[PDB]
């Protein structure tokens, strides 16, 4: 394939795999992970080599579920203090009903996480499908409202009772 | 120390409600000392927390680590278990921390739950000084949330959800096991005596499950082979650890050097002569394998364990069966060819 054996590439590909930590080659049925996307988006996890919050989130972002529930909730990811709640409120607002699930199948309390904070930041969000709330608490409240106004749970409560 | 210890009355019982959990489930919980009598214990489940007899003792053993199972095999497990404690009135005795086996008698109970209707009564005995959280539990006859969330820095462990209730053993320590194994074995021996409503005679059958196990297994084994009324044991093949041994030491029973795998001291130390015991009294032992040999259902095979090894007549056997209330168990294995029935 090559300048006969005069010339040889097999230096350059040592090297390569010694580097081969990163490299995850593909099988068809001889190994696991038989499924190319299952196989691309798995290379990316292990080969960040970053904590358990950033695999998280990334799988938060792409939108996978079972990517999460398969290789990062396994036996001792040790979770730091803070980190699962994040997680949760990241999922919240974003409208991840399969990730709000996971996280409270995995240690993550409802009753715990909320409080009025959580929920005051909770109703200001903005990363989600349109909503008519702020055309509702602008009618209850005065005449006009001045823009770039926080929704407090006050006006939230007054926007029920209408 | 030489356990000087303060016997101070119970102050410490009542209601826990699962937080964080899979799913809302409550369990009735209740401290109390090694040296509690039996039949008091037998009293406060039967009229304080309104259970009935047991038709069914189910008992579970396994190693304290944290192991994990091959796929396709725990989830036929966790099926026929589920099936034997559903379809006959039982009573499933555990460790009841979330280490080892009971994660996994806990996950089949959670898989169940999800598709089927009834309950199990997982009745949990686990010791008091390895609770992680062993405050937030002192209100009595109160309902005090418990977050089943652990960390592994902790030191101890977390109490497992899906134990619908719990029995709490305590001699002082803090952080050792060992305070709960004379309580378990003396309520079994006392729920054995107990009279089934049939009136011919026979007691509450017991059946010890063993998965994975360890050098402490071989031995309570062996104390389960040498009760006056044997009690028929149950292991698997599929678990690396001492009921692998055990599997492998059923072939070619009554090539000594091949033991040694350094799970114990070296061939200087050995239990070999008590598991050569064991298999000398393989009577009792019904091993499983999957697919490998015939009943290849747990629910099945914990169920014919009780009946040949009860090694009783054919009238116990059926009334037995009848009080299962299991039909395909006495058409298969009671009436059989030629098996003498009294006039």
Same mark, same amino acid.
């Given at each position: 394939?090559?300048r006969?054996?005069?010339?040889?590439l097999?230096?350059?590909l040592?090297e390569?795999m010694?580097?081969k930590e990163?490299?995850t080659?593909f099988?068809?049925?001889?190994?696991?992970?038989?499924?190319?996307?299952?196989?691309?988006?798995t290379a *990316?996890l292990?080969?960040? $080599?970053?904590?358990?919050?950033?695999?998280?989130? #990334?799988a938060?972002?792409?939108?996978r !579920?079972?990517?999460?529930r398969?290789?990062?909730?396994?036996y001792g990811?040790?979770w730091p203090?803070?980190?699962?709640?994040?997680?949760?409120l990241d999922?919240?607002?974003?409208?991840?009903v399969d990730?709000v699930k996971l996280l409270?199948e995995?240690?993550?309390?409802?009753?715990?996480f909320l409080?009025?904070s959580? *929920?005051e930041?909770?109703? $200001?969000?903005?990363h989600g499908?349109?909503?008519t #709330?702020?055309?509702?608490?602008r009618d !209850?409240?005065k005449?006009?409202?001045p823009?770039?106004?926080?929704?407090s749970?006050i006006?939230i409560?007054?926007v029920?009772?209408? | 120390?030489?356990k000087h210890?303060?016997l101070?009355?119970?102050?410490?019982f009542?209601t826990?409600?699962?937080?964080?959990?899979?799913?809302?489930?409550?369990a009735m919980?209740?401290?109390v000392?090694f040296?509690?009598?039996?039949d008091?214990?037998?009293?406060?489940?039967?009229?304080?927390w309104?259970l009935?007899?047991?038709?069914?003792l189910?008992?579970?053993?396994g190693?304290?680590?944290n192991?994990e199972?091959?796929?396709?095999?725990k989830?036929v497990f966790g099926?026929?278990l589920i099936?034997?404690?559903?379809?006959?009135g039982?009573?499933?005795?555990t460790?009841?921390?979330?280490?080892?086996?009971?994660?996994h008698v806990?996950?089949?109970?959670?898989?169940?739950?999800?598709?089927?209707?009834?309950?199990?009564?997982?009745?949990?005995?686990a010791p008091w000084?390895?609770v992680?959280?062993?405050?937030?539990?002192?209100?009595?006859?109160?309902?005090?949330?418990?977050q089943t969330?652990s960390?592994?820095?902790?030191?101890?462990?977390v109490l497992?959800s899906?134990?619908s209730?719990?029995?709490?053993a305590?001699?002082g320590?803090?952080?050792?096991y060992?305070?709960?194994?004379?309580?378990?074995?003396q309520?079994?021996k006392?729920?054995?005596?107990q009279?089934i409503?049939?009136?011919?005679?026979?007691?509450?059958?017991?059946?010890?499950l063993?998965v994975?196990?360890?050098?402490?297994?071989?031995s309570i084994?062996?104390?389960?082979?040498?009760?006056?009324?044997?009690v028929?044991v149950?292991?698997?093949?599929?678990?690396?650890?001492?009921?692998?041994?055990?599997?492998?030491?059923?072939?070619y029973?009554?090539v000594?050097?091949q033991?040694?795998?350094?799970?114990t001291r070296?061939?200087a130390q050995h239990?070999?002569?008590?598991?050569?015991?064991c298999?000398?009294?393989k009577?009792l032992?019904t091993?499983?394998?999957?697919?490998?040999?015939?009943?290849?259902?747990?629910?099945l095979?914990?169920?014919?364990a009780?009946?040949?090894?009860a090694?009783?007549?054919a009238?116990?056997?059926?009334?037995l069966?009848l009080?299962?209330?299991?039909v395909?168990?006495?058409r298969?294995q009671?009436?059989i060819?030629?098996?003498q029935?009294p006039?």
């Amino acid at each position: 394939y090559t300048r006969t054996q005069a010339q040889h590439l097999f230096i350059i590909l040592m090297e390569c795999m010694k580097k081969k930590e990163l490299i995850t080659v593909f099988r068809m049925g001889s190994e696991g992970h038989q499924d190319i996307d299952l196989a691309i988006l798995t290379a *990316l996890l292990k080969g960040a $080599n970053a904590s358990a919050p950033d695999q998280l989130s #990334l799988a938060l972002a792409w939108n996978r !579920v079972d990517i999460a529930r398969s290789q990062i909730f396994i036996y001792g990811q040790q979770w730091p203090v803070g980190s699962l709640e994040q997680a949760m409120l990241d999922a919240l607002v974003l409208d991840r009903v399969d990730f709000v699930k996971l996280l409270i199948e995995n240690g993550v309390s409802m009753h715990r996480f909320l409080t009025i904070s959580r *929920l005051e930041e909770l109703y $200001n969000t903005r990363h989600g499908p349109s909503n008519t #709330l702020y055309h509702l608490v602008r009618d !209850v409240k005065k005449g006009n409202l001045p823009p770039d106004y926080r929704i407090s749970l006050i006006d939230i409560g007054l926007v029920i009772e209408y | 120390i030489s356990k000087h210890t303060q016997l101070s009355p119970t102050d410490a019982f009542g209601t826990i409600e699962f937080q964080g959990g899979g799913h809302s489930n409550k369990a009735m919980y209740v401290r109390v000392s090694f040296d509690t009598k039996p039949d008091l214990l037998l009293h406060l489940m039967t009229k304080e927390w309104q259970l009935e007899l047991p038709k069914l003792l189910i008992s579970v053993h396994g190693g304290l680590q944290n192991f994990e199972l091959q796929p396709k095999l725990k989830q036929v497990f966790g099926k026929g278990l589920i099936k034997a404690a559903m379809t006959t009135g039982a009573w499933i005795f555990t460790g009841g921390v979330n280490t080892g086996v009971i994660r996994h008698v806990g996950d089949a109970l959670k898989d169940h739950a999800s598709k089927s209707r009834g309950k199990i009564c997982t009745i949990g005995i686990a010791p008091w000084g390895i609770v992680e959280n062993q405050e937030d539990l002192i209100g009595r006859d109160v309902v005090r949330p418990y977050q089943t969330m652990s960390n592994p820095m902790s030191k101890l462990t977390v109490l497992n959800s899906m134990h619908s209730h719990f029995i709490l053993a305590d001699n002082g320590t803090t952080g050792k096991y060992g305070a709960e194994v004379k309580l378990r074995r003396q309520l079994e021996k006392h729920i054995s005596l107990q009279k089934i409503n049939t009136r011919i005679g026979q007691g509450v059958p017991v059946v010890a499950l063993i998965v994975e196990g360890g050098p402490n297994v071989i031995s309570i084994v062996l104390e389960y082979l040498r009760d006056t009324p044997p009690v028929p044991v149950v292991v698997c093949d599929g678990s690396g650890r001492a009921s692998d041994i055990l599997a492998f030491g059923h072939k070619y029973s009554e090539v000594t050097i091949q033991k040694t795998f350094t799970y114990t001291r070296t061939q200087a130390q050995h239990l070999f002569i008590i598991l050569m015991e064991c298999m000398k009294k393989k009577e009792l032992i019904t091993v499983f394998r999957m697919g490998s040999e015939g009943h290849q259902d747990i629910d099945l095979a914990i169920l014919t364990a009780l009946l040949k090894g009860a090694n009783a007549s054919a009238p116990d056997q059926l009334s037995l069966a009848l009080a299962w209330n299991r039909v395909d168990i006495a058409r298969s294995q009671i009436f059989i060819y030629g098996q003498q029935w009294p006039v």
